[PDB]
Amino acid sequence: EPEPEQVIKNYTEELKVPPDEDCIICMEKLSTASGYSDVTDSKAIGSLAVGHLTKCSHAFHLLCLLAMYCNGNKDGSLQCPSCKTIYGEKTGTQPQGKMEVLRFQMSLPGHEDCGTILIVYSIPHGIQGPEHPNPGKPFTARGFPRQCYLPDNAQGRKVLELLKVAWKRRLIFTVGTSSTTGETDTVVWNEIHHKTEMDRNITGHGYPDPNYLQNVLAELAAQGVTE
Ligand SMILES: Nc1ncnc2c1ncn2[C@@H]1O[C@H](COP(=O)(O)OP(=O)(O)OC[C@H]2O[C@@H](O)[C@H](O)[C@@H]2O)[C@@H](O)[C@H]1O
Ligand SMILES: [Zn+2]
Ligand SMILES: [Zn+2]
């Protein structure tokens, strides 16, 4: 993985003279100096260095870009803050654990045509790593194992494989704060809704749900997991 300054040099093409149009990262004119210049320090990147992104052609202070990148885990990918194009292979802060998958013949509410896939995520507590909020300090993992259900049809089996890619790229979980329990520095769901109940009366996260499959299949396209 290249260095943070080099990551921004890739997937970027410097602008000769920046327009009057604003940089949406620092809310300052691209013509002027980055608004994060006072707290961000590069080697090869100035404060009036500006390029637009390779494919999506959105322009920012390359220092802002760098300021952004650096606030996250530094996997060598970069996400356009305007249109969210992924540059490289986005990955994420998911702690070590296991993903088991099972199938059973019983159908789910709304999918009586087919069988059911059981996904079991088991993730132990540990010590936060460099990518996590407070490196070195412990993190908790609440509620594991967490059982998840997919209709065993064509889409459901597709989403299954896409979720195996998500796991590989440490995308399904993250260390952070729980919206449910308010507890901090802990393993929580990250951006990819999972059905944890067959019967949606129990918790609110179950079946039937017509559009779940369509929702998640785009919820992980938003993290760069596609065909
Ligand atoms: N029970 C749930 N099942 C699936 N997704 C859930 C659940 N509760 C919340 N979510 C989704 O998880 C995301 C973040 O919610 P958090 O509460 O921060 O995540 P987490 O604390 O892991 O979720 C609560 C989890 O803890 C367990 O005690 C509980 O049974 C559930 O699986 C949001 O997308 C939210 O909609
Ligand atoms: Zn800026
Ligand atoms: Zn863009």
UniProtKB/Swiss-Prot annotation:
Query: What lineage is this protein's organism placed in?
Result: Eukaryota, Metazoa, Chordata, Craniata, Vertebrata
Q: Quaternary arrangement and interactors, per the entry?
A: Homodimer. May form a heterodimer with other members of the Deltex family. Interacts with NOTCH1.
Family assignment?
Answer: Belongs to the Deltex family.
What is the role of the protein in this entry? Regulator of Notch signaling, a signaling pathway involved in cell-cell communications that regulates a broad spectrum of cell-fate determinations. Probably acts both as a positive and negative regulator of Notch, depending on the developmental and cell context. Mediates the antineural activity of Notch, possibly by inhibiting the transcriptional activation mediated by MATCH1. Functions as a ubiquitin ligase protein in vitro, suggesting that it may regulate the Notch pathway via some ubiquitin ligase activity.
Q: Which residues of the full protein are shown?
A: 390 to 616 of 622
The protein depicted here goes by the name Probable E3 ubiquitin-protein ligase DTX2
Which cell locations does it reside in?
Cytoplasm; Nucleus
Domain comment in the entry: The WWE domains are thought to mediate some protein-protein interaction, and are frequently found in ubiquitin ligases.
| Annotated coiled-coil segments of the chain | none
Zn finger limits (RING-type): 23-84
